[PDB]
Amino acid sequence: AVQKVVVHPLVLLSVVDHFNRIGKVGNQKRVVGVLLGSWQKKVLDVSNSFAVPFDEDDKDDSVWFLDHDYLENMYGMFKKVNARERIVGWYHTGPK
Amino acid sequence: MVLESTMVCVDNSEYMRNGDFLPTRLQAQQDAVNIVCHSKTRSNPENNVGLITLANDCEVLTTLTPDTGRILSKLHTVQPKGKITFCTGIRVAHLALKHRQGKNHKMRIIAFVGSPVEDNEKDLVKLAKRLKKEKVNVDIINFGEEEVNTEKLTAFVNTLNGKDGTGSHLVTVPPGPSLADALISSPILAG
Amino acid sequence: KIMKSEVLRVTHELQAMKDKIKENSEKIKVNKTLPYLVSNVIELLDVDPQRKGKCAVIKTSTRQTYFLPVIGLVDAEKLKPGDLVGVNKDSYLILETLPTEYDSRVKAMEVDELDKQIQELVEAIVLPMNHKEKFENLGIQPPKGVLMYGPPGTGKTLLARACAAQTKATFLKLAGPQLVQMFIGDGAKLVRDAFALAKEKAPSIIFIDELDAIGTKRFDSEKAGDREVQRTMLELLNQLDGFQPNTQVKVIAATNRVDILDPALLRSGRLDRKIEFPMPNEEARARIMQIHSRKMNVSPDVNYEELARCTDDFNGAQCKAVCVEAGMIALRRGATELTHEDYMEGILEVQ
Amino acid sequence: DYRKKLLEHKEIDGRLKELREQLKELTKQYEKSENDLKALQSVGQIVGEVLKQLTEEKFIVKATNGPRYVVGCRRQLDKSKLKPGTRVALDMTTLTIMRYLPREPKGCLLYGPPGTGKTLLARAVASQLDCNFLKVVSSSIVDGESARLIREMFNYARDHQPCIIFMDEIDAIGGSADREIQRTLMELLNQMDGFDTLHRVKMIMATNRPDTLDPALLRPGRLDRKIHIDLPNEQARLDILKIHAGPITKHGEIDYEAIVKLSDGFNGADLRNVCTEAGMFAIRADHDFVVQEDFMKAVRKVADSKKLESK
């Protein structure tokens, strides 16, 4: 389907913001955000994105926490201000 | 008023549709959720109610919100698959209690169990020790049964329940023609 | 009914949609409320090679040409080369298209809020506004073009104008020389604009006069000034033939002289009704004169014989002029009530 | 008792499933609204024209307002339509290009002396296919400056390959006052006998009498064939009479043979007017049904009147 994609530094700098607003937690596990882009064209293009809280469990690895309401609200307002960009997929900062 | 969070777990299995007991009591306990959430609305409307099932794959239908308007619409499409799950069903709620808006709200989680527990006594007493450690209110409600009602469940509740004074209560409903509404409305946990 | 239990969820999704369209339908009012200027729109079909080719040609009042496709909500009367369209800042889009016509001026021509033949005439003008519901079963197709002519001295103009008051609809006034101007190619624009106003507005009444003078085909081959209204009439007939919208509001035509007649004027959409006036009677003119003068105060003794006999080859407007003239000297006579002899006195006065 | 419950539940489920059509149909329109709202996101496009090009990648553009500019090449479009001599479009940002802006039996003779209705047939064909919509006025002269207008119309005729020409009442133009007329005729000869492809474009001429029609111009060269129409065909007249007899109900006994046979030298639209006049004549008796006797009488009288007014 998609031969190649285009990733802008803005989202990785948003990950830098994720490492910014931490404020010395003592947890600092993997954080799952929501990536936005254009799936209309064959080549994927990333403009901007937002962040959603994501938490897991120490022992059990099957634990994952997301939010439907916050996602629909953020994507709703983002679609309200800009209709040129929609949802595509997600990303995590975990090395593994 | 009273500031607390409400977490309700519904059974999506086919054991609720059995012909001996109530004719798909899922709708009845749905109406129970309706009247208790409307009761909480009348008392303290600022409380939020989340919804998730006991199945293998945990999927939140509606995030905790003070408005039950869309929740009533999300009460449908139960997706009758899977059988039962316990541990991750607890870990998907009690650990997710930190995602609430108000930090002044107390932690309260209930459950509707229509299927036999597949987990041994070890996991039970361990998870009970965990819930007792983090001190979260838990109300055990079991609709329908196959084997004996309370055997290890008694010791389970006793070990899970701390602070004997004004603590949690156990709800045990036998077979009968009467509904589950006025029956679960008997303790102080409802209304 | 277990299979029909899934319908409730669908209805919930639909009402949820109705709840979530409130905002996007709300912003429409505040966004589209004030178009800042007016631009001219010209439709031009492009080709992209969905990905369907769509485009348009725009002309600003500041004489600056821009580029833009065809967009906006559902269009019906749009896509036509009209004017007065909604536009926002720098967007140059199309929201609300309203047609006010072109060079308005021709359009604001005027604002208006013998028994056996006038009976047929009245029935003729009434039936298209009446029997349409009965035209389905009977299958009777109402005539469009109606030719009203006759010898000079009839007064058919104010008679038809009087019937226009009976139609209760809006009346318009268009003459022969009004179609003749200094410019060229005015015919097509005039016809299309008139039909546009006839399309947009209510089923009003349209009456044109002197079609014989402007329809002269000039047998003599030497010279003449106006060939325009000839082809204007030809185009009018063409649009009254090859066009389905012609079932809409009728256009009434009248000719003063029968010396010039076009054999191609015969059709349902074109001129159909033909009524010749064989020296209209007296007593009827006395009747309509009585109907016109019934409002004014007159001594209720009239023989009618003298006033019927003294009127020869006179219009209806001339009879009304006789009434007015009778009212003129009645003011300086000292009498507060009109008499009988004042009528004939007025006749011998103005005529 | 158990059998009726199925029917009842069928009724409830029926009225439950029949209320969706009042929603799901307009939901598509409601969605289409927001689709258009997302279709309005593209704005700020301007125009331009290409004259001289040096670099194949980047050329010079000419705005309508008169200032001149230069733009680049977008990775989407190719060098195929990038060639000069084609009006293109530009954007307010970066001056890119979304797309371009495109600019906007070889003869027959029909003479109508016995009556009319040829225009009805031409209208029938035009409403049938006609391959296009075009009309040519009888006199384009009064509109010597009309020559360039004729050449412009023919230029458009060369622009659009498929063409069909309809000319009604050509007997008017067929007739220093005469000198300019002869000059216009010479122009017509020069244009028709010039270099053009007539194998595609078709011309149709309508007229009245064979007098001013210039039999020399009616020649095989400037006109291949000639078709005379005295009156609509028997099958055609019967057909149109049948379709005109559709909305109007009549007596159980009906014969169109008399109506067709008794009709001589009459026209379709005219005959239709005679039919409507017969209906308005028979409406005086305020009867819901109308016999063909009154129809035959009314048609006879009215047609006779038309024959008397045929002068």
SS (HEC) of chain B: CCCEEEEEEECCCCHHHCCCCCCCCHHHHHHHHHHHHHHHHHHCCCCCEEEEECCCCCCCCEEEECCCHHHHHHCCCCCCCCCCCCHHHHHCCCCHHHHCCCCCCEEEEEEEECCCCCCCHHHHHHHHHHHHHHCCEEEEEECCCCCCCCCHHHHHHHHHCCCCCCCCCCEECCCCCCCCHHHHCCCCCCC
Whether C9 and B73 have beta carbons less than 8 Å apart is answered as yes
CB-based contact, D93 to chain A, within 8 Å = no
Q: Could you give the CA distance from residue D15 to residue D17 in angstroms, rounded to a whole number?
A: 6
Residue D245 identity (one-letter amino acid): A
CA D263 vs CA B22, B75, C51, C265, D260: distances in Å: 85, 78, 57, 21, 5
CB within 8 Å: C13 and B70:
no
**Alpha carbon of residue A57 to chain centroid:** 20
Token pair listed for B10: 């519904």
CB neighbours of B90 closer than 8 A, spacing ≥ 6? B127, B131
CB within 8 Å: B95 and A62:
no
Residue whose structure tokens are 């509001």: C249
Residue D109 three-state SS: strand
Whether C148 and C196 have beta carbons less than 8 Å apart is answered as no
C14: distance to nearest CA of chain D, Å?
A: 8
- C246 secondary structure, DSSP code: G
Q: Could you give the CA distance from residue C321 to residue C327 in angstroms, rounded to a whole number?
A: 10
Alpha helices in D160-282 (DSSP H): 177-192, 234-244, 257-261, 268-282
**Alpha carbon of residue D283 to chain centroid:** 36
- Least CA distance to A83: which residue of chain D? D38
Whether D170 and D207 have beta carbons less than 8 Å apart is answered as yes
Q: How many CA atoms lie within 13 A of B5 on its CB side?
A: 23
CB neighbours of D142 closer than 8 A, spacing ≥ 6? C184, C227, C228, C231
Residue whose structure tokens are 């000719």: C255
After which residues does a break in chain D occur, C–N more than 2.5 Å? 104, 143, 175
Q: How many CA atoms lie within 13 A of B59 on its CB side?
A: 12
Q: Could you give the CA distance from residue C215 to residue B28 in angstroms, rounded to a whole number?
A: 87
Would you tell me how many other CB atoms lie within 10 Å of the CB of residue D61?
22
- Least CA distance to D40: which residue of chain A? A83
Would you tell me how many other CB atoms lie within 10 Å of the CB of residue C39?
20
CB neighbours of C320 closer than 8 A, spacing ≥ 6? C158, C289, C292
Residues paired with residue C43 on neighbouring β-strands, in sequence order: C56
Q: How many CA atoms lie within 13 A of D22 on its CB side?
A: 7
C147: distance to nearest CA of chain D, Å?
A: 14
Q: Could you give the CA distance from residue D60 to residue D68 in angstroms, rounded to a whole number?
A: 8
A6: distance to nearest CA of chain B, Å?
A: 32
Whether B143 and B25 have beta carbons less than 8 Å apart is answered as yes
CB within 8 Å: A66 and B62:
no
Within 8 A of A65 by CB-CB distance, chain B residues are 92, 95-96, 99
Residue C271 three-state SS: strand
Strands D45-50 and D60-62: antiparallel
Angle between helices D234-244 and D268-282 (to 10 degrees): 40
B189 exposed, middle or buried (CB, 10 Å; 0-12, 13-18, 19+)? middle
CB within 8 Å: D142 and C228:
yes
Strands C39-43 and C56-60: antiparallel
C39: distance to nearest CA of chain B, Å?
A: 46
In whole angstroms, how large is the CA radius of gyration of chain C?
29
Token pair listed for A42: 């064959």
* First vs last C-alpha separation in chain A: 26
CB within 8 Å: D247 and C136:
yes
Dihedral of CA atoms B97, B102, B103, B108 in degrees, nearest 10, equals: -40
Q: Could you give the CA distance from residue C347 to residue D8 in angstroms, rounded to a whole number?
A: 87
Strands C39-43 and B171-172: unpaired
CB-based contact, D38 to chain A, within 8 Å = yes
- The count of residues in chain C is 351
User: Which of A52, A62, A74 is the best residue to mutate to test the B interface, defined by the most B CB atoms within 10 Å of its own CB?
Assistant: A62
CA C91 vs CA C32, C71, D261: distances in Å: 12, 11, 67
Q: How many CA atoms lie within 13 A of C102 on its CB side?
A: 16
Token pair listed for B130: 């965990």
Annotated ligand binding at C62? The verdict is: no
Annotated ligand binding at C151? The verdict is: yes
For residue D113, give the nearest of D267, D280, D9, D281 by alpha carbon.
Answer: D267
Whether chain C lies against chain B with 3 or more Cβ pairs closer than 8 A is yes
C284: distance to nearest CA of chain D, Å?
A: 24
C121 exposed, middle or buried (CB, 10 Å; 0-12, 13-18, 19+)? buried
Q: Kindly list the strands in the beta sheet with B106-113, ordered across the sheet, starting from the edge strand earlier in the chain.
A: B62-65, B49-53, B4-10, B106-113, B137-142, B171-172
Whether A54 and A66 have beta carbons less than 8 Å apart is answered as yes
CB-based contact, D24 to chain C, within 8 Å = yes
Q: Could you give the CA distance from residue C276 to residue C255 in angstroms, rounded to a whole number?
A: 11
- Least CA distance to B71: which residue of chain C? C12
**Alpha carbon of residue D290 to chain centroid:** 37
Q: Could you give the CA distance from residue C190 to residue C106 in angstroms, rounded to a whole number?
A: 8
* First vs last C-alpha separation in chain B: 13
Q: Kindly list the strands in the beta sheet with A32-38, ordered across the sheet, starting from the edge strand earlier in the chain.
A: A5-6, A44-46, A32-38, A86-92
CB-based contact, A66 to chain B, within 8 Å = yes
Q: Could you give the CA distance from residue C199 to residue C314 in angstroms, rounded to a whole number?
A: 38
Dihedral of CA atoms D127, D132, D137, D141 in degrees, nearest 10, equals: 180
**Alpha carbon of residue D266 to chain centroid:** 26
CA dihedral sign of residues C74, C80, C84, C86: positive
List all chains that touch chain B, counting a touch as 3 or more CB pairs closer than 8 Å. A, C
For residue C231, give the nearest of D137, D215, D51, A20 by alpha carbon.
Answer: D137
Q: How many CA atoms lie within 13 A of D287 on its CB side?
A: 11
Contacts 24+ apart (CB under 8 A), B44-49: B44/B1, B44/B2, B44/B3, B44/B4, B46/B1, B46/B3, B46/B102, B47/B3, B47/B4, B47/B5, B47/B6, B47/B105, B48/B5, B48/B6, B48/B100, B48/B101, B48/B102, B48/B105, B49/B5, B49/B6, B49/B7, B49/B8
Q: How many CA atoms lie within 13 A of D100 on its CB side?
A: 20
CB-based contact, A71 to chain B, within 8 Å = no
Within 8 A of B70 by CB-CB distance, chain C residues are 16
For residue D48, give the nearest of D32, D70, D30 by alpha carbon.
Answer: D70
Token pair listed for C180: 């003749």
Q: Could you give the CA distance from residue D138 to residue D165 in angstroms, rounded to a whole number?
A: 11
D299 exposed, middle or buried (CB, 10 Å; 0-12, 13-18, 19+)? buried
B143: distance to nearest CA of chain C, Å?
A: 22
CB-based contact, A83 to chain D, within 8 Å = yes
For residue C21, give the nearest of D27, D228, A86, B180 by alpha carbon.
Answer: D27
Within 8 A of D38 by CB-CB distance, chain A residues are 83
String of DSSP letters for A18-75: HTTTT-S-S-----EEEEEEE-SSSSEEE---B-------SS-SS-----HHHHHHHH
- C66 secondary structure, DSSP code: B
Q: Could you give the CA distance from residue B89 to residue A62 in angstroms, rounded to a whole number?
A: 10
User: Which of D35, D36, D38, D40 is the best residue to mutate to test the A interface, defined by the most A CB atoms within 10 Å of its own CB?
Assistant: D38
* First vs last C-alpha separation in chain D: 84
Residues paired with residue C255 on neighbouring β-strands, in sequence order: C149
CA D215 vs CA B186, D191, D211, D221: distances in Å: 111, 19, 8, 12
Token pair listed for D163: 């063409």
CB-based contact, D23 to chain C, within 8 Å = yes
CB neighbours of D274 closer than 8 A, spacing ≥ 6? D266, D298, D299, D302, D303, D306
CB within 8 Å: C16 and B77:
no
Residues paired with residue D206 on neighbouring β-strands, in sequence order: D110
Experimental method: cryo-EM
- C216 secondary structure, DSSP code: -
Q: How many CA atoms lie within 13 A of C208 on its CB side?
A: 23
Whether C78 and C70 have beta carbons less than 8 Å apart is answered as no
Angle at C215 between CA C209 and CA C219, to 5 degrees: 145
String of DSSP letters for C284-323: HHHHHHHHHHSSS-B-S----HHHHHS--S--HHHHHHHH
Kindly report the backbone phi and psi dihedral angles of residue C60, in degrees, each rounded to the nearest multiple of 5, phi listed first.
Answer: -80, 155
Residue whose structure tokens are 């709200």: B105
CB within 8 Å: C71 and D126:
no
* First vs last C-alpha separation in chain C: 93
Q: Give the A:B interface size as CB pairs under 8 Å.
A: 29
Q: Among partner residues B63, B92, B98, which is closest to A67 by beta-carbon distance?
A: B63
CB within 8 Å: A55 and B62:
no
CA D148 vs CA C126, C230, D153: distances in Å: 49, 22, 9
For residue A67, give the nearest of B100, B71, B112 by alpha carbon.
Answer: B100
Token pair listed for D213: 């029609």
Q: Give the B:C interface size as CB pairs under 8 Å.
A: 11
Token pair listed for C2: 């277990």
Token pair listed for C103: 């060079």
Q: Could you give the CA distance from residue C116 to residue C121 in angstroms, rounded to a whole number?
A: 9
Q: Could you give the CA distance from residue C146 to residue C272 in angstroms, rounded to a whole number?
A: 5
Q: Resolution for this model in angstroms, one decimal place?
A: 6.8
Strands A32-38 and A86-92: antiparallel
Token pair listed for B89: 């069903």
For residue C212, give the nearest of C244, C241, C254, C245 by alpha carbon.
Answer: C254
User: Which of C12, C13, C20 is the best residue to mutate to test the B interface, defined by the most B CB atoms within 10 Å of its own CB?
Assistant: C12
Q: Could you give the CA distance from residue D234 to residue D227 in angstroms, rounded to a whole number?
A: 17
Q: Could you give the CA distance from residue B141 to residue C288 in angstroms, rounded to a whole number?
A: 98
Residue C5 three-state SS: helix
Residues paired with residue B140 on neighbouring β-strands, in sequence order: B111
